[PDB]
Amino acid sequence: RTERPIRVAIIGYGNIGQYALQAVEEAPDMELAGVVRRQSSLEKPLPGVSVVSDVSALGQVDVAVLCTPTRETPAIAKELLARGIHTIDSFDIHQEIVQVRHELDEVARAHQAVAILAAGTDPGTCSMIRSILEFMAPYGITYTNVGPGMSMGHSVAVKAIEGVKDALALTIPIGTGLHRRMVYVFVHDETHVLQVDDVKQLIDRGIGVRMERKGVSGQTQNQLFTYEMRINNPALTSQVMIASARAAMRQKPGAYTMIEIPIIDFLYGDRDELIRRLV
Amino acid sequence: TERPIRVAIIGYGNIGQYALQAVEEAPDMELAGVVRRQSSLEKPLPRELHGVSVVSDVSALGQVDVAVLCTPTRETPAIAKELLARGIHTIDSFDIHQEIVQVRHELDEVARAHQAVAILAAGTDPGTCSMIRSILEFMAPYGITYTNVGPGMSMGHSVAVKAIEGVKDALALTIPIGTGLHRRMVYVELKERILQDPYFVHDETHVLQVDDVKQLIDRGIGVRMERKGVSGQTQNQLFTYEMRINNPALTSQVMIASARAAMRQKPGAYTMIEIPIIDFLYGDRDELIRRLV
Amino acid sequence: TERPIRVAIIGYGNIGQYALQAVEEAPDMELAGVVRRQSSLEKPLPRELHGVSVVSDVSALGQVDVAVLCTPTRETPAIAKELLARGIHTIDSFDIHQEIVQVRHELDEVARAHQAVAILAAGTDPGTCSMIRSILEFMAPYGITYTNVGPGMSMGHSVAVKAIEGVKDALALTIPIGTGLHRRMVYVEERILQDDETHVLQVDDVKQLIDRGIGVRMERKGVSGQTQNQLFTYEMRINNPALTSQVMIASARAAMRQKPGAYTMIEIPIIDFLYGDRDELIRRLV
Ligand SMILES: NC(=O)c1ccc[n+]([C@@H]2O[C@H](COP(=O)([O-])OP(=O)(O)OC[C@H]3O[C@@H](n4cnc5c(N)ncnc54)[C@H](OP(=O)(O)O)[C@@H]3O)[C@@H](O)[C@H]2O)c1
C-alpha cells in the first residue's frame, strides 16, 4: 500500500553531514543509503552505515544531500546529476547562485534529475521569508541582522595569518544589516581583537537571526514585519536540506532555489491534511 | 458643532495631503481650501482636490480662521508672519530646534499686534515628543533623557544628498544607534565616488548605490524616548515612551489639533508646552476630565 | 534566640549612608556606630546620625562583631587589615578587579592569625554579578558571556576627567553598545579628550545629570555537555549603592558562618548570606 522510502546518500561527513544524518533517520519517508567520503577519510577510524567512496557502492540512491565545501559543491553536483540522482546543497555564496543555478539546470534537464541549490539557513529559508516580506510590502527596506554567532569563513580567514595558533572570528550584528567583527586569538568594518587562552573554549554553533522590513502595502505606509530565530545553525541547515530532498522528488528536471518551489512540496504528509492543518 | 472652524491648508506636499484628511475627520472643522504656488496650479488637478477650492492666495478662500502651514521649513516663518498680519491664526511644525525660541519671539510680536494666535513647532519630534519630554523632566528633575528616532528618512538630510554633484537620486536615513546618537544610511542612484563629506563628516556614515531609491521609500518612523532620573531624592526612576507611526499622518493630525487650540488662546505665539492639554481636545470640559483624568 | 550581630559602619559617605539603612532593616543585626575620620567629626551631625555613636575608632563602639568598610578603594585593604588584626570581621566591595587575588591573599593572612573573616569585593559587579557569571560558566562551559553595563555613572572615569584641564566639573558615563563594548559620554562644565569611542558635550550644570541607578545586562550563549545554543539572560535595573550596601550587609551575615580567612563571593555557600533557619530556607527556596 504505502510508498517506498526515499533513499538518501550524504556526500561529505563533516559538520553539516553529521547533522544531516540525524535528519535523514528522523524523516519518516526517508532511509539512509550510506555516506560517501573522500578516500583519505575511509582510512581514518570509523565513528552499520555503509561508508563508501562513490554513490555506486550504495545501491539505489534517489537523492544525494551534498554537505561538501562550497567551492567543490557545484562540480560534485554536476557529476551526480549526470547519473540521474537528484542533488541538494546549501551553497552559500549569494552572488554566484544565479550562475550556478543555470549551470546546474543544464545538466539536470538532460538526465531527468532535480537539483535544489542554496537550500540552507540564509541562502535558504531566510530567502523564503525575505521574498514573502517583499511582496507583502513592495516599497521599503529589509534588514537581515545575523545575531551574535560564528562566521565560519571569517575565522577560517583569520586562521590563515601568521601568529599565535588558532583563532575565532565572529560577525556581531550592529543593526541595519551592518556588522562588527570580533576576533579571538577585512578592514572596511570595525574590528576588535582579543587574545585568549583556548579559542576552542569559546565555540558554539547556535546563531541568532533578526530580519526586519518596514514598508508600504499597496499604498499604506508603516507596515512592520519582524522575523527572529535563535537556532542551532547546522541542525537547521541539515533539516532544511532534508526537506528539500523530499521536495526534489516532486519537481520536473531542472535546478531550483527555494523561492521556485511550492512551500507544501517540502512537507511530509497528505496534501489535504497539511492544508487543513496549516493554511 | 454650530459654526465650524474654517481651515486653510498652505502647501500641498506630504503634510498637506495628510492634513486634508485630518481636517475632514475633525468634527469641529471644515476645509476652506488649499493655497499653492502659481506654478503648481498650472500642473493638473489631483483627484482628491475635486470640489476643493485651490488658489494662490488665502484671500480667494474668504473667511479663514486658521492656516495650517505645510511649507518647507526655511520658508515657513515668513509665510506665518504674513497670515498672522491678516489676523489669521497659524499652525506650523517648524523643525529646527535651535531656532525655535527666536522664531517664537518673532511670531509673538506679529500675532499680538494683530489679535492672532500662532502655534509653532507642533508636529512629531518638535511637537508631541516635546510635550512628553517635558512631562518626564518635571517628574524626575535629575538625570538624562535620550530621544532615539528609529530607522526612517530624514528629509532635510536626504535632500542634502540630492544636492551634491554626481547624484541622480538619493535617499538618506537617520538610524538610532543608542544614547541619542545616530548613524546615517545613504542610498544613491547613479571610495568610488566623490562621496567624501559635504558636511556629514561629523556623523558615522555608510553609502550604497541602489537601482531605484524610489523603491526604498516608506514614510513610517519609530521613536524611543528614555529617561532615568530622580523623583525628589529617590533614584532609579525609569521612563520609556515609544511610537511606531505614520510620520506625516501624525504631524498633520497634531497640527489640526493645534488648530483647535489656537481658537482658544489669547493672541501670541506658543509652543505646545505652553497650552493646557485639554485645549487640544474636542469635547465638553467635564466630559473629558471624566473620560481621561 | 541568638544575640544580634553588632555591625559598625566604617566611612560614612555614599555607600555608608545606604549601609546604615541596610543594617537597620536587617533583623539579625544591630548598629554599633559609625567610624569617621576625625576631620569629619568636626562637621555638623547628619540628622540621620542623631542618637548614633559616631566616633573616630571602633574601640569606642563596645562589642563589634563585623565592620562594613565603605571607604575609598585604595584605602580599604589597609583599613581591613587593621580591623582583622583585632579579630573583627570585615566586609568590603573593593573593586579593582586585577587586584583581588592579591588583596585576598593579604587579607587572608591576617584573618587566619586573629580568628577573623574577611569577605572582600562583595558589591554588585565585584560581587553578585560575579556569582551570576560563575553559575553561567559551569552551566554552559563552552561559549561567551557579555556583561553590558547599561547607562550609568562611572566612578573612576568621572573622577579621571574631573581633573585634567579647565574641568570646573564633569560627569563621565559608560554606555553599553553591545557584546561587552562601551562608549564614553562626557558632559563638562576644547578637543582634549586623551587619557575608546567617546563623545563630549558641554552643559551648564553637571550635577543636574546625576542619577545613581544603573542597568546591567548579562547574556551567554554556549554549550551544555555537547548540546549547543543554550541561552541565558540576566538583567537588573537598580539603585547601585542601595544594592551594594545590601550585599555587604548580607555578607556580614555570611562572615559569621565561615572559618577564618579571606573570601570572595564565589567562595561562600549562597545559603550563608540568608537570614533564617537552614532547613526552612531550603524548603522555601530550593
Ligand atoms: N546555506 C547555509 O545556511 C549554510 C550554512 C552552513 C553551511 N553551508 C554549506 O555547508 C558547507 C560547510 O559545511 P560544514 O560546516 O559541515 O563543513 P566541514 O565540516 O568542513 O565539512 C566539509 C566536508 O566535505 C568533505 N571535504 C572537505 N574538503 C573536500 C574537498 N576538497 N573535496 C571534497 N570533499 C571535501 C569532508 O567530508 P569527508 O571527510 O567525508 O570527505 C568534510 O568533512 C559550505 O560549503 C556551505 O556552503 C550552508
Ligand SMILES: NC(=O)c1ccc[n+]([C@@H]2O[C@H](COP(=O)([O-])OP(=O)(O)OC[C@H]3O[C@@H](n4cnc5c(N)ncnc54)[C@H](OP(=O)(O)O)[C@@H]3O)[C@@H](O)[C@H]2O)c1
Ligand atoms: N515637526 C515635525 O515633527 C515635522 C515632521 C515632518 C515634517 N515637518 C515639516 O513639514 C514641512 C513640509 O514637509 P513635507 O514632507 O510636506 O514637504 P513637501 O512634500 O516638500 O511639501 C512642501 C510643500 O510646500 C509648498 N511650497 C510653498 N512654498 C514653497 C517653496 N518656496 N519651495 C518649495 N515648496 C514650497 C509646495 O506645495 P505647493 O506646490 O502646493 O505650493 C510643497 O509641496 C517641512 O519643511 C518640515 O519642517 C515637521
Ligand SMILES: NC(=O)c1ccc[n+]([C@@H]2O[C@H](COP(=O)([O-])OP(=O)(O)OC[C@H]3O[C@@H](n4cnc5c(N)ncnc54)[C@H](OP(=O)(O)O)[C@@H]3O)[C@@H](O)[C@H]2O)c1
Ligand atoms: N559594585 C561594587 O563593588 C561597588 C559599588 C559601589 C561602591 N564600591 C566601593 O565603594 C567605595 C566608594 O563608596 P562611596 O560611593 O560611599 O564613596 P564616598 O562617597 O567617596 O565615601 C567614602 C567615605 O570614606 C571616608 N573616606 C574618604 N576618603 C578617605 C580616606 N582617604 N581615608 C579614610 N577614609 C576616607 C569618608 O567617610 P568619613 O568622612 O565619614 O570618614 C567618605 O565619605 C569605593 O572604594 C568602591 O570600591 C564598590
